[PDB]
Amino acid sequence: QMSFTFASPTQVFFNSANVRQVDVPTQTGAFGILAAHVPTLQVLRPGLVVVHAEDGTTSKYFVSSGSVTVNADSSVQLLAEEAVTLDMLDLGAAKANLEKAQSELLGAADEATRAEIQIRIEANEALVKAL
Amino acid sequence: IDTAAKFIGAGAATVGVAGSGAGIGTVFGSLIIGYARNPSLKQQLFSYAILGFALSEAMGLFCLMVAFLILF
Amino acid sequence: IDTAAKFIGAGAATVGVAGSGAGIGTVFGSLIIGYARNPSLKQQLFSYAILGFALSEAMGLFCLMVAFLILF
Amino acid sequence: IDTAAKFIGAGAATVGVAGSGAGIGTVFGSLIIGYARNPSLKQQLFSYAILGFALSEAMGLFCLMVAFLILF
Amino acid sequence: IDTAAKFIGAGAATVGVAGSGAGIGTVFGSLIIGYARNPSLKQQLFSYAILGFALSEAMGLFCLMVAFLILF
Amino acid sequence: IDTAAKFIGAGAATVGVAGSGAGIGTVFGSLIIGYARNPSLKQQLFSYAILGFALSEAMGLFCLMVAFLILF
Amino acid sequence: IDTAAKFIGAGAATVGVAGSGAGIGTVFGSLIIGYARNPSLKQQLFSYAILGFALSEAMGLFCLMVAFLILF
Amino acid sequence: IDTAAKFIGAGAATVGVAGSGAGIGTVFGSLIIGYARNPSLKQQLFSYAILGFALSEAMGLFCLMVAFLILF
Amino acid sequence: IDTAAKFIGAGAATVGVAGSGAGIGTVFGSLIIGYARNPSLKQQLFSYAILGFALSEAMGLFCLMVAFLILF
Amino acid sequence: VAYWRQAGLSYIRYSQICAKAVRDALKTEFKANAMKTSGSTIKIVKV
Amino acid sequence: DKIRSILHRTHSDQFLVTFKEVGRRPPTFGDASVIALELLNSGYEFDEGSIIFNRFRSVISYKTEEKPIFSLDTISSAESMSIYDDIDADVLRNYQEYSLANIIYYSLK
């Protein structure tokens, strides 16, 4: 057993809920955390969140950016700035943004502007990894 | 000379299965730590393990084809 | 020559167990680092370590068949 | 001496396939421990795995052409 | 022919220990790096390193018995 | 003697090409896990991998030159 | 023959020290990666590195014993 | 015997170049998987890679001079 | 035979330098991937890099001692 | 150390744009939540 | 603003930054991020801090509460952190930055 807590600033999903394993899109690829997983802190990356429920059927979500935490005792918490379910995201407008984002990349030389446009590329390029 | 060097030369080609056996422990070991980060067990990960061990034991079956061609 | 090359040839085929020896330490090594990432020990992970020690000792059993063919 | 040493001379060149045997297990094994970090499986990673397996069977295309030269 | 080839048969059979020593370095390394991630050290994981250092030396006692067979 | 042990001297020189083949996989396999951390493909890591493929296949060239030396 | 094959057999057993040499690097390398993860350097992890250099030099002392027995 | 076994003794000394070739693949691979963590490309990690490929082919120049002593 | 086997026996112990040259590639590799984790570059890790390359070159200097003893 | 690091950006500036492109991709049924979120009411004072 | 005027004259020279328009529009994580950005852009590498706010309890009752923020990245690595493994020096530089934006937003909410 492990208590799982997953939420955003606007909406709450899990609160000390009994769950066996969770997959998280961290910076270091995608880490999988089981019931008695090691104490490892890793920050988030735009991608897919897999939450293995207690009854065979799994719910999956999409994240923009945030943080996950696994502790010295069996308890996990995951938070994101804006996390939305696969249900409410359009596959149309995601390509419109990506192509506009890959246009400003070659039209900006400033070292500060380059990072800001590439992050938007990364986020929009992750919007097709699920839809 | 024509039959003697065919028995000690089919033994040196049996050391070519040292790569297929140590390589199989690397194609399955890197699949153990692979599914440890999880979660695609059936399909994707273990499916790529089968296409990897087949390309690992292929240098064991071809090396046992040069072994049996020296004794039979 | 007839009893000579089969006595030095059965020794060269015993260099095929160097692959299964280190190939068994890796499949049981990645299971030690895999169960360190926790927690599906019994079933799934440690049930695959048998499937990884069997495909590695299969080349060992194939190499120990060759050295016993020139010894008996 | 001439025909006798051509038999225990392509058998020692057949144990050179142990580098390509475990090298294909180290290459494909890293790709199984790479797509597990996800998600650039289609192209990028598995496409580079065909560049690493060819550069590992390249030593296998130069070691099997050596033993096949001392044969016929 | 009879007295000589048994000395050049237990010599090439000692080249099978080259896996039992390196594979033990692979398993005891994965228990050295595995315990770093913590915390099951005095149980679970270091109790699996004894089960790994044995299966690796299992091809190191099977290979050693062949080198002790060709000699005495 | 002069024509005999030159044939069994080129074969064992071809076994020195077992380090380049397993070196090629462990150098182009760590770059198959480097781009898995991303995103220096065709930048720094894949550029140094060619500088890692050259340093390993040169120890295969310096070994194939010994195998060609004992053949012509 | 009898005073000859003892020198072409005691040398082949020194090729069993290839696992003791590459096992010492792997058991210490993962100890250098385990102490890079911190913090129990003084005992626990580097203390176990002594228990990993011993179970890896044991397959190198038993192989050096067989080489010394065929030389003296 | 005298003008024969030295030609098959330089072949066995060229098998020591399987560690200088597979040691470069292990060295120039961890400096490709380590630079993936970034950003110590120059001055630190690749500078230590010059001192990593200095104690790797040092066992190979010592193995290329052992074969050169059994020829010239 | 009495003069022949010493030359064939010196090369056979020179193949035991393939384990020391790759064990230096693993110890300096896991220090190159052990310095990327940061920050104690001087002391601790790279200070134990020579302490891990001492026990791994200890198998080479003992093997090249058995190769020189059959030459002088 | 990523690409936004060294470029002058912190993780907060990373997280801000990451969320912004998620807001833009929304369809008109949950677009009402986009005005509720993404605040910039705050003023900067520096004497 | 009602902190820039109530406890100012007394500590007028001890000011780092001031924020207005708070309480006009319901706060967002976006507001807290602007609070997070301005803190890390100032040349003040703080050893430790504390955030003081009014925690809600009911319609009539509330209590002033302190929460210590261990947001120094030099203080992020302690003897109690030695329990944890698989961390970067500059991955805490990401987590500490974000866990700061959370608590600011929480205190603001």
Curated annotation (Swiss-Prot), chain A:
GO terms, biological process: aerobic respiration; mitochondrial proton-transporting ATP synthase complex assembly; proton motive force-driven ATP synthesis; proton motive force-driven mitochondrial ATP synthesis; proton transmembrane transport
N6-acetyllysine modified-residue sites: K100, K129
GO cellular component terms, semicolon-separated: mitochondrial envelope; mitochondrial inner membrane; mitochondrion; proton-transporting ATP synthase complex
Location of N6-succinyllysine modifications: K100, K129
Record localization: Mitochondrion; Mitochondrion inner membrane
Keywords: Acetylation, ATP synthesis, CF(1), Hydrogen ion transport, Ion transport, Membrane, Mitochondrion, Mitochondrion inner membrane, Transit peptide, Transport
Primary location group: mitochondrion
UniProt entry tagged with the keyword Transport: yes
GO molecular function annotation: proton transmembrane transporter activity; proton-transporting ATP synthase activity, rotational mechanism; structural molecule activity
UniProt similarity note: Belongs to the ATPase epsilon chain family.
Assembly and binders: Component of the ATP synthase complex composed at least of ATP5F1A/subunit alpha, ATP5F1B/subunit beta, ATP5MC1/subunit c (homooctomer), MT-ATP6/subunit a, MT-ATP8/subunit 8, ATP5ME/subunit e, ATP5MF/subunit f, ATP5MG/subunit g, ATP5MK/subunit k, ATP5MJ/subunit j, ATP5F1C/subunit gamma, ATP5F1D/subunit delta, ATP5F1E/subunit epsilon, ATP5PF/subunit F6, ATP5PB/subunit b, ATP5PD/subunit d, ATP5PO/subunit OSCP.
Protein name: ATP synthase F(1) complex subunit delta, mitochondrial
Species this protein is from: Bos taurus
From Swiss-Prot, chains B, C, D, E, F, G, H, I:
Keywords associated with the record: CF(0), Hydrogen ion transport, Ion transport, Lipid-binding, Membrane, Methylation, Mitochondrion, Transit peptide, Transmembrane, Transmembrane helix, Transport
Residues that span the membrane, as ranges: 15-35, 50-70
Residues at the site labelled Reversibly protonated during proton transport: E57
Cystine bridges: none
N6,N6,N6-trimethyllysine PTM positions: K42
Keyword Iron attributed: no
Disease listed for this protein: This protein is the major protein stored in the storage bodies of animals or humans affected with ceroid lipofuscinosis (Batten disease).
Additional detail: There are three genes which encode the ATP synthase proteolipid and they specify precursors with different import sequences but identical mature proteins.
Function according to Swiss-Prot or TrEMBL: Subunit c, of the mitochondrial membrane ATP synthase complex (F(1)F(0) ATP synthase or Complex V) that produces ATP from ADP in the presence of a proton gradient across the membrane which is generated by electron transport complexes of the respiratory chain. ATP synthase complex consist of a soluble F(1) head domain - the catalytic core - and a membrane F(1) domain - the membrane proton channel. These two domains are linked by a central stalk rotating inside the F(1) region and a stationary peripheral stalk.
Protein name in the entry: ATP synthase F(0) complex subunit C1, mitochondrial
Species assigned in the record: Bos taurus
Residues of the full protein shown: 63 to 134 of 136
Swiss-Prot record, chain J:
Major site of localization recorded for this protein: mitochondrion
Gene symbol of the encoding locus: ATP5F1E
Modified residues (N6-acetyllysine): K20, K31, K36, K43
Annotated organism of origin: Bos taurus (Bovine)
GO MF, one example: proton-transporting ATP synthase activity, rotational mechanism
Family: Belongs to the eukaryotic ATPase epsilon family.
Alphabetic keyword roster: Acetylation, ATP synthesis, CF(1), Hydrogen ion transport, Ion transport, Membrane, Mitochondrion, Mitochondrion inner membrane, Transport
UniProt key word Ligase: no
Record's protein name: ATP synthase F(1) complex subunit epsilon, mitochondrial
Swiss-Prot record, chain K:
N6-acetyllysine carried by residues: K20, K63
Compartmental location: Mitochondrion inner membrane
Domain of life from the UniProt record: Eukaryota
N6-succinyllysine PTM sites in chain numbering: K20
Phosphoserine found at: S12
Subunit structure: Component of the ATP synthase complex composed at least of ATP5F1A/subunit alpha, ATP5F1B/subunit beta, ATP5MC1/subunit c (homooctomer), MT-ATP6/subunit a, MT-ATP8/subunit 8, ATP5ME/subunit e, ATP5MF/subunit f, ATP5MG/subunit g, ATP5MK/subunit k, ATP5MJ/subunit j, ATP5F1C/subunit gamma, ATP5F1D/subunit delta, ATP5F1E/subunit epsilon, ATP5PF/subunit F6, ATP5PB/subunit b, ATP5PD/subunit d, ATP5PO/subunit OSCP.
Stated family: Belongs to the ATPase gamma chain family.
Function text: Subunit gamma, of the mitochondrial membrane ATP synthase complex (F(1)F(0) ATP synthase or Complex V) that produces ATP from ADP in the presence of a proton gradient across the membrane which is generated by electron transport complexes of the respiratory chain. ATP synthase complex consist of a soluble F(1) head domain - the catalytic core - and a membrane F(1) domain - the membrane proton channel. These two domains are linked by a central stalk rotating inside the F(1) region and a stationary peripheral stalk.
The protein's name in its UniProt record: ATP synthase F(1) complex subunit gamma, mitochondrial
Lineage: Eukaryota, Metazoa, Chordata, Craniata, Vertebrata
